[PDB]
Amino acid sequence: VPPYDVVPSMRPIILVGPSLKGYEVTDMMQKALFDFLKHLFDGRISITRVTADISLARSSLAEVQSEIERIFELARTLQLVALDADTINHPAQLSKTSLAPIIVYIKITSPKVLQRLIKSRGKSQSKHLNVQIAASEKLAQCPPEMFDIILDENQLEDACEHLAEYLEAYWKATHPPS
């Protein structure tokens, strides 16, 4: 058992947990959150779009590790890293690599509102009713203290008052004054 594990110097920010990604419901809720952190922390963030499944160390080892080492490059200049990962739907899905990303957990406080969200997306997402509520339940079955940042706020500004201030408390933790 090694006591120290080579992690990046600035942890990559990940947004997840509303429900299963790969849908019009969960992704378009997160796409509003990537827009807020783009211009609020402009010049001190690196926001990327993730394609290959990084829960593997499908894709081979080389195509994933060359993207993991790109996250290793984005920790060298001591700035924020943000990931648009499209298959991450579990806390322990990213527990075996050497990244340890920031688990921002979007919390839908009421499970009945999700399937009302589902019937607002037309009949395309109305064919995918109970399949989204599975990992919407399983992430709600996971303990909230295992996560990092919890967002239970319906309005934009109240989910974003936590989403800006927590990492601003995290930036001053990483960076000391002169």
Binding site: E153, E165, Y166
Partner: peptide
């Protein structure tokens, strides 16, 4: 909204 808003404060402050 008194038993909710300051419970959003009890999470952030710790």
């Amino acid at each position: 909204q008194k038993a909710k808003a300051e419970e959003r404060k009890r999470r952030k402050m710790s």
